[PDB]
Amino acid sequence: QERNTAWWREGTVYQVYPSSFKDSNGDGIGDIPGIISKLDYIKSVGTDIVWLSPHYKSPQVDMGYDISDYKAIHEPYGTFDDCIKLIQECHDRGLKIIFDLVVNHTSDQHEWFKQSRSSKSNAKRDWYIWKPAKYDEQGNRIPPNNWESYFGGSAWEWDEETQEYYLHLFAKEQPDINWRNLQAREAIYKDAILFWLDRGIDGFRIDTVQIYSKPEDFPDAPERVPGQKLQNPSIIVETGPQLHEILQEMNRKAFSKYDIMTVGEGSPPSLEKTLEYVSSSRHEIDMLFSFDFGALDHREIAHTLNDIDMVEMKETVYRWQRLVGKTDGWTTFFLENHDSGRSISRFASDATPEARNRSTKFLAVLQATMSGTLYLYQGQEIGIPNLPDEVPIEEYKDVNSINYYNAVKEDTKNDPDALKKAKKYLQKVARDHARSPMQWDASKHSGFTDGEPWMIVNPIYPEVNVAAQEWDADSGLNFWRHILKFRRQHKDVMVYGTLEVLDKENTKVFTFTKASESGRTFLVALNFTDKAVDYDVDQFASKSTLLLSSIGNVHHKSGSLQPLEAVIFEIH
Ligand SMILES: OC[C@H]1O[C@H](O)[C@H](O)[C@@H](O)[C@@H]1O
Numbered sequence: 001q002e003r004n005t006a007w008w009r010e011g012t013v014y015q016v017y018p019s020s021f022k023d024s025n026g027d028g029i030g031d032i033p034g035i036i037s038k039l040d041y042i043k044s045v046g047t048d049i050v051w052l053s054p055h056y057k058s059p060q061v062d063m064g065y066d067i068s069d070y071k072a073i074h075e076p077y078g079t080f081d082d083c084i085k086l087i088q089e090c091h092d093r094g095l096k097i098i099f100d101l102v103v104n105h106t107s108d109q110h111e112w113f114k115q116s117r118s119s120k121s122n123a124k125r126d127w128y129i130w131k132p133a134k135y136d137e138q139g140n141r142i143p144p145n146n147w148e149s150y151f152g153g154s155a156w157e158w159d160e161e162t163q164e165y166y167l168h169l170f171a172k173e174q175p176d177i178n179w180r181n182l183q184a185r186e187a188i189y190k191d192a193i194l195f196w197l198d199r200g201i202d203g204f205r206i207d208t209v210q211i212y213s214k215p216e217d218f219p220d221a222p223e224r225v226p227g228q229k230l231q232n233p234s235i236i237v238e239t240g241p242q243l244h245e246i247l248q249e250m251n252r253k254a255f256s257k258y259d260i261m262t263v264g265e266g267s268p269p270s271l272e273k274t275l276e277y278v279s280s281s282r283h284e285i286d287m288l289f290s291f292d293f294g295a296l297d298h299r300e301i302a303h304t305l306n307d308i309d310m311v312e313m314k315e316t317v318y319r320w321q322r323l324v325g326k327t328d329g330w331t332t333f334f335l336e337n338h339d340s341g342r343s344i345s346r347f348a349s350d351a352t353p354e355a356r357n358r359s360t361k362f363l364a365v366l367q368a369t370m371s372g373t374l375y376l377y378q379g380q381e382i383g384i385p386n387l388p389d390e391v392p393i394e395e396y397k398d399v400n401s402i403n404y405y406n407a408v409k410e411d412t413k414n415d416p417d418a419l420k421k422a423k424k425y426l427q428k429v430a431r432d433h434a435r436s437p438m439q440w441d442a443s444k445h446s447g448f449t450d451g452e453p454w455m456i457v458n459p460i461y462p463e464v465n466v467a468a469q470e471w472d473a474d475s476g477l478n479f480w481r482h483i484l485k486f487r488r489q490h491k492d493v494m495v496y497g498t499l500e501v502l503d504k505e506n507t508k509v510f511t512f513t514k515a516s517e518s519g520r521t522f523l524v525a526l527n528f529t530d531k532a533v534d535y536d537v538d539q540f541a542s543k544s545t546l547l548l549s550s551i552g553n554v555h556h557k558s559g560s561l562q563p564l565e566a567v568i569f570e571i572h
């Protein structure tokens, strides 16, 4: 198997969130014709590959990640031929398109589940994970173990009609597929994978790629949150006994028969296990998204915020950037997606118009200099920040936000201080900041819809919008376009370059080198603080020439880095 890999290795991915990108018929929901009408705009950002988030038939409990039919399209997004049209419209403009592959679980409204839960004698019973109840010391009915769902509460839902519990790592409406059942494997391969590979898509975003295979004895998860009864089982379900078997099967049967790229969500903590997923040798998948970088400012399982430790951040960047050049694997880099808070709000300053612009360019240098495939999320190019403090919790429509807040309200019996702390946490890292409609212009709802949007449009939209940034040479959008042109022109060091960290102990400035095997080497310095810091490039590079600064080359002062200034130098 000799393949065309350069297109995914060097390509820039733009992630589209169907519900929030563009509404073409004023019902307040985004749709496929809206996407088709904005494809020229996507191309103009610098995009090679479009990553469409789940658009298939779904009750929208988890906004597309609970699928009720792999072969049909969610009616508000448009018709089945609208989906085929989008694939062609992308292709017409030189854009590839990848779909979201959600196969750890299905909707509870999927016909496969309606059959599974119907009776214990049903032919498709074993297609999902059913377990009998356990009884505690005092005779009460309890689940098979302490596993917690990622959205709160136990991971086992009680089906009274069949007196048995079904496994659900996500919502009660997302029952987990039993991957031990070969008949269910074939059903997924045919409907969720080969059906769309046969319609000409260029690849998939594989969800929760580590958790398909559960250990046969479903043992209690470890005490990750001291003294709490239920425990998230991510650490014991990740890379299960059949996981690599499954990925190997998906490659030989589907991925290897088409010219595509596969990107998996979730990576192991070690290099040798990570290479078991992405090494060319292995013929499984091409690259992985790691949660490490996104986890520097919060701990999801404990719903706690924390200050970013500069040295841990550097070690996290190096942990995965080390795959490029020293191995036959690959890696990715991203600061945003549908499951995260806005990047300028979490990693830079969003306080003022000037700060939003300076921060957008700052993070742009951080991402542009990282090796591996680069991923942008709709909005990131124009510096959309997080929803401000004045937006109340009722507007946070995401199920993860509602379940957490409700669990605080229940477990603390409306402790008002606990609710304020729960809201503060949600204001920094909720998934809702990434789902507020795309900001196109300064008209009603930032020109996203003529109707009433399905979720609140960020109220900074009059300042922050595409049309405002299009003809402004100094906008974050035109900075993003230039930095991607720079990235392609210097791909030997930016895309394929080996990364090495210098001045490790420095807590204010991150300094690293990107070296090609051709010879060429760049040095990147980022001042993550908001005060001027003394910085001397000559202590880390014999000879150097400034190529670009995020604050403007003429504003760069030798012997210092300005607040949130990132610089690229050619050295050696
Ligand atoms: O499908 C359940 C969850 O897993 C997926 O990986 C998605 O990225 C996330 O948005 C979703 O809530």
Ligand SMILES: [Ca+2]
Binding pocket: 023, 024, 025, 026, 027, 028, 029, 030, 031, 076
């Ligand atoms: Ca619509």
